[PDB]
A paper describes a structure:
YeaZ is involved in a protein network that is essential for bacteria. yeaZ is an essential gene in many bacteria, such as Escherichia coli (yeaZ), Salmonella typhimurium LT2 (yeaZ), Bacillus subtilis (ydiC), Streptococcus pneumoniae (spr0129), Pseudo­monas aeruginosa (PA14_16710) and Francisella novicida (FTN_1148). TmYeaZ belongs to the actin-like ATPase superfamily, which typically contains a duplication of ribonuclease H-like domains.
The crystal structure of TmYeaZ was determined in space group C222 at 2.5 Å resolution using the MAD method. TmYeaZ is composed of nine β-strands (β1–­β9), six α-helices (α1–α6) and four 310-helices (η1–η4). In TmYeaZ, the first ribonuclease H-like domain is composed from both the N-terminus (residues 1–100) and the C-terminus (residues 160–193) of the protein. Compared with the other two YeaZs, TmYeaZ lacks the 20-residue αβ insertion between β9 and α5 in the second domain. As a monomer of His-tagged SeMet-TmYeaZ would have a calculated molecular weight of 24 404 Da, it is likely that TmYeaZ exists as a dimer in solution. Based on its structure, TmYeaZ by itself is not likely to be an ATPase owing to the absence of a clearly defined ATP-binding site. The most prominent common feature of these proteins is the prevalence of the sequence motif GPGXXTGXR located at the N-­terminus of a helix (α2 of TmYeaZ). Other conserved residues of the YeaZ homologs that are clustered around this motif include residues from the N-terminus of α1 (Lys32 and His33), the C-terminus of β1 (Asp7 and Thr8), the C-terminal portion of β6 (Arg112, Ala113 and Arg114), β7 (Tyr119) and the C-­terminus of α6 (Pro188, Tyr190 and Gln192).
Numbering used by the authors:
A (entry chain A): 1 to 193
B (entry chain B): 0 to 187
Amino acid sequence: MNVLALDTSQRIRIGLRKGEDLFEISYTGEKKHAEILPVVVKKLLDELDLKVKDLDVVGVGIGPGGLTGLRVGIATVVGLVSPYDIPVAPLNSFEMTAKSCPADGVVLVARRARKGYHYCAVYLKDKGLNPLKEPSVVSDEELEEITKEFSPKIVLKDDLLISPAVLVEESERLFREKKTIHYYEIEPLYLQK
Amino acid sequence: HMNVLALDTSQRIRIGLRKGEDLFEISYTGEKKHAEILPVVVKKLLDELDLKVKDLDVVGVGIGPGGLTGLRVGIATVVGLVSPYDIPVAPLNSFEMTAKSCPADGVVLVARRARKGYHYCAVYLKDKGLNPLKEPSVVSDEELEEITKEFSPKIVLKDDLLISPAVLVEESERLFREKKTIHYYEIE
């Protein structure tokens, strides 16, 4: 199974698998230096003797996150896959954050949007990931009400670990479950929700 | 923040390279042939950051528990790298790094397989910092389940361990600031 997965909702997270062999790469900081990543990735593809043509699925994160980062990551994936119609797995960044956490139980994912607001979701992670409150934007006051309502055992605020390995595992699962879509269908239903 | 390279080869290969607020993290898992590329990648990253090795403030290296060969190799790699310049070295406990790589707080059991019938095992209290309730040791598999019944951990990091290269960099930065680094000739 050949997989490439990319999330740009906060940092740059890239995951590359060919069979039992997985590279993971992250970058955070000033944008000037992210330039080196395509080069780096090409080198890793060359090492694995993998051509973009041979990928079974490409995973991309659809947010919630920063607009700029997300449109860059998505346009990148849309373009890479376009010539060969490689199935795309749209990945929920909040769900990738939850599953990147090795503990189980009631989890609350939040992250700053402007001034006095946050994006926010809560999941029961005891199977399983099972949504109790789907991601949306809330005031800080409502955030406290929500926390006080779900007494989450685990809470992942602001600086979110996403594991590229989980991205890759998640693209694989969507592929197998026939829940991937075509590159031309990622605008329409990244708008609608 | 400063200029830091850190590396743990206790199970998979984890690498963090930071310059100020810029940080690259790399991990590899799978057959050893392909690890050949990691040093090329890391040199491209260093050139991209305008970092020479002599510009590094500290180099972190994982010292286990883990696979002995992989530890020996990661350590040897570090010795080759820093001995010309005596860059301060931060030894990193792999289980502590694993525990710290987990977002949740509470009582954390960390365990990995050591040989037929045995695990390396440790227990920490995560409440803000990390506090060793039991330092790493080799227990029998029966002892392991006893340790588990008995400490009632909220969280259990077993056999397949997530270590975040960002965490290795943060830790190396700390030991440097606390002057609890050592010389390349002192690592084991």
